[PDB]
Scaffold this active site. Sequence first.
Site, short mmCIF file in Angstrom:
data_model
loop_
_atom_site.label_atom_id
_atom_site.label_comp_id
_atom_site.label_asym_id
_atom_site.label_seq_id
_atom_site.Cartn_x
_atom_site.Cartn_y
_atom_site.Cartn_z
N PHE A 142 0.83 -1.20 0.00
CA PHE A 142 0.00 0.00 0.00
C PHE A 142 0.87 1.26 0.00
O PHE A 142 1.86 1.35 0.73
CB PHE A 142 -0.90 0.04 1.24
CG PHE A 142 -2.06 -0.91 1.19
CD1 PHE A 142 -1.89 -2.25 1.46
CD2 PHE A 142 -3.34 -0.45 0.88
CE1 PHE A 142 -2.96 -3.13 1.42
CE2 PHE A 142 -4.41 -1.32 0.84
CZ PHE A 142 -4.22 -2.66 1.11
N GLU B 251 -6.10 -2.40 12.43
CA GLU B 251 -5.25 -3.58 12.58
C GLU B 251 -3.81 -3.20 12.88
O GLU B 251 -2.89 -3.55 12.12
CB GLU B 251 -5.38 -4.50 11.38
CG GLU B 251 -6.82 -5.03 11.30
CD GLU B 251 -7.14 -5.92 10.15
OE1 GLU B 251 -6.26 -6.18 9.30
OE2 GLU B 251 -8.30 -6.39 10.11
N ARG C 50 -6.52 -15.34 16.72
CA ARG C 50 -6.16 -16.62 16.06
C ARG C 50 -5.74 -17.61 17.15
O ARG C 50 -6.48 -17.80 18.13
CB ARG C 50 -5.15 -16.37 14.97
CG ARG C 50 -5.61 -15.46 13.90
CD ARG C 50 -4.72 -15.41 12.67
NE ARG C 50 -5.17 -14.35 11.78
CZ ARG C 50 -6.27 -14.42 11.03
NH1 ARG C 50 -7.02 -15.51 10.99
NH2 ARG C 50 -6.62 -13.36 10.30
N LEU D 1 -3.79 -5.98 22.16
CA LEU D 1 -5.03 -5.47 22.72
C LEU D 1 -4.88 -5.24 24.22
O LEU D 1 -5.35 -4.23 24.75
CB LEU D 1 -6.18 -6.43 22.46
CG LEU D 1 -7.55 -5.99 22.97
CD1 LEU D 1 -7.99 -4.68 22.35
CD2 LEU D 1 -8.57 -7.09 22.69
N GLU E 134 -15.19 -4.76 12.21
CA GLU E 134 -15.00 -5.09 10.81
C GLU E 134 -15.04 -6.60 10.74
O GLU E 134 -14.15 -7.24 11.30
CB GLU E 134 -13.67 -4.56 10.28
CG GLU E 134 -13.46 -4.83 8.80
CD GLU E 134 -12.03 -4.61 8.38
OE1 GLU E 134 -11.51 -3.51 8.54
OE2 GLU E 134 -11.39 -5.58 7.92
N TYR F 32 -11.54 -13.36 4.50
CA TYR F 32 -10.64 -12.25 4.25
C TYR F 32 -10.08 -12.30 2.83
O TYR F 32 -10.34 -13.22 2.05
CB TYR F 32 -9.56 -12.18 5.34
CG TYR F 32 -8.55 -13.31 5.40
CD1 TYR F 32 -7.44 -13.34 4.56
CD2 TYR F 32 -8.66 -14.31 6.35
CE1 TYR F 32 -6.50 -14.33 4.64
CE2 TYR F 32 -7.73 -15.35 6.42
CZ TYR F 32 -6.64 -15.33 5.57
OH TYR F 32 -5.69 -16.33 5.63
N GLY F 33 -9.31 -11.28 2.48
CA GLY F 33 -8.82 -11.19 1.13
C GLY F 33 -9.88 -10.78 0.14
O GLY F 33 -9.80 -11.14 -1.03
N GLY F 34 -10.87 -10.02 0.59
CA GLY F 34 -11.94 -9.55 -0.26
C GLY F 34 -13.11 -10.49 -0.39
O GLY F 34 -14.00 -10.26 -1.22
N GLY G 271 -15.34 -5.85 -2.64
CA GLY G 271 -15.20 -7.19 -2.13
C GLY G 271 -16.46 -8.01 -2.33
O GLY G 271 -17.57 -7.49 -2.27
N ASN G 272 -16.25 -9.33 -2.53
CA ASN G 272 -17.31 -10.31 -2.76
C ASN G 272 -18.25 -10.45 -1.56
O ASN G 272 -19.35 -10.99 -1.71
CB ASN G 272 -16.71 -11.73 -3.05
CG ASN G 272 -15.72 -11.73 -4.21
OD1 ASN G 272 -16.10 -11.54 -5.35
ND2 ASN G 272 -14.44 -11.99 -3.91
NA NA Z 1 -14.48 -0.42 13.60
NA NA Z 2 -14.18 -1.17 -1.69
NA NA Z 3 -14.31 -1.54 7.12
#
Ligand code: NA
Ligand code: NA
Ligand code: NA
Lengths: 385, 74
Positions: free
Chosen positions: A2, A67, A114, A121, A185, A190-192, A231-232
């Site tokens: 990114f 994250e 995980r 946190l 979220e 994940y990954g879209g 995303g799907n």
């Molecule tokens: Na949030």
């Molecule tokens: Na988007």
């Molecule tokens: Na979001």
Amino acid sequence: KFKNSTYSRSSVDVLYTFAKCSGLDLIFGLNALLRTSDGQWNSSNAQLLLDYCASKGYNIDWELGNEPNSFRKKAGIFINGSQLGKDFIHLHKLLRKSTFKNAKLYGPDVGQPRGKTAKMLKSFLKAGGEVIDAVTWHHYYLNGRTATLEDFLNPDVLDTFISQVQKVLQVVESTRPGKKVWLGETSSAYGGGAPGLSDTFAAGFMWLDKLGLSARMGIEVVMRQVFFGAGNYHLVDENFDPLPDYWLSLLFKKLVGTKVLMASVQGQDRRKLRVYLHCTNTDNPRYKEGDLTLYAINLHNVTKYLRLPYPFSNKQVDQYLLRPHGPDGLLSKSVQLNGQTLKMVDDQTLPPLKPKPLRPGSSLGLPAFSYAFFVIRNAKVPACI
Amino acid sequence: QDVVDLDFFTQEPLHLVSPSFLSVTIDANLATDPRFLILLGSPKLRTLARGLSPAYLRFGGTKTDFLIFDPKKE
Ligand code: NA
Ligand code: NA
Ligand code: NA
Ligand code: NA
């Protein structure tokens, strides 16, 4: 991977207007990776945005970072939880000094723990927990690149969410007991999202089950990734057409109330027949104080027949049964409510979501691989009154 | 064999969720789509979003930490 991009006042304005005109409350995430040379959050850019929004009279709540547990990998910088807490304290002071009417602050939007603990946190909540109004964390069941239909139907996959919730709640109770906990979220994969899966009827098992367990376990708000986008796992595609999970969400919104109760099966629980119970949403004009909303998932390959305990055994029940429409079966992007395909009436008009009244005393038939809401009318539950 | 009896616990709530319990996000990456303003103006999209009120709309995601406000940008 990114790089940075810029956004304009007009983009802020359109986002705010979209939320306001739709009756939604905007939460805006600020960039936590603007850092000073001594390792602190540099609030300069956020200050410009806060000042702009205040000058416009916008009522916005805020987050800082997304994250942060993966900053080392995504951005080549490690910010520990204690430092992130100090950064949140700074942001809190900026909100207090602003003209916002009691803007709220949520964080730290950590990824799910995980197989590990939620170490960042914990340190964040020790350092900065006093200034946040709710703790946010994220969750996905699977990698969208490898998930299969079998996974989306697998009660063992669904059950993995329980341990993730337990680990997060343990950390919160150990540092800030009673602080509200939100999924900030969350979605199927994940990954879209999983292509050909996260946008189908089959995605609804993960979505409804996550809502049921979140409510039962003490999560106060669940934020679905995403309403609309690439995303799907979108609820609405970029043709602006609602997918099955949109209709599921709309029915949930209309029928499920805020008071969380409990239902369970008698006898052996193979985890494929999953049941949740709330008071009915009092805002629904069809129903009245005391009514109950049962919602249920059947992941068996045959119909199961649910019998309600006395005194609900012989009450009038309204069925809202969702089944996929068309030859794709569980992979369909269209859904029927009690045998009628759900579609908008026009671009500005949602369809009526009509109940099917069942015969009083009849067992509730839940077909293989389906989910449904059942409203128990005249339940007269004092806890719902 | 296919009949399942349910037990209910209704004497008092286990938890209270928010009226906005079912909330939604827009990924921060959508703000890099040049059509962002037009997309969010869709009447169909607004109708669908209103169906989910009351709810939070969270604007965030990985790109949260890769976006900069530019007050001079048109
Ligand atoms: Na949030
Ligand atoms: Na988007
Ligand atoms: Na979001
Ligand atoms: Na689950």
